């Protein structure tokens, strides 16, 4: 319903926490199911 809008990506202040740790928890998941 809004006019004049444009498309753009938006960020969240949680990927400086989560996406610095979800890759770290996936790295721990690599060691979790290694044997």
């Amino acid at each position: 319903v809004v006019i004049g809008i444009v498309n753009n990506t938006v960020y969240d202040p949680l990927q400086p926490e989560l996406d610095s740790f979800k890759e770290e928890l996936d790295k721990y998941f690599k060691n979790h199911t290694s044997p």
């Binding site: 319903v1 809004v2 006019i3 004049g4």
Partner: protein, 49 residues
């Protein structure tokens, strides 16, 4: 320009966002502007006539 031209250089602004900077000075946010922009215009067009 809005209100800036009385206090320095004239800064041009589009008029749909000037209402968004004037609802916000009342106490209701700018969320209630673009959602029903057409009926605000019809309430404004019929008022001056």
């Amino acid at each position: 320009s809005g209100w800036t031209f009385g206090a320095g250089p004239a800064l041009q602004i589009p008029f749909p966002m000037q209402m968004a900077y004037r609802f916000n000075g009342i106490g209701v946010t700018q969320n209630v502007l673009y959602e029903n922009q057409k009926l605000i215009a019809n309430q404004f067009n019929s008022a001056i006539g």
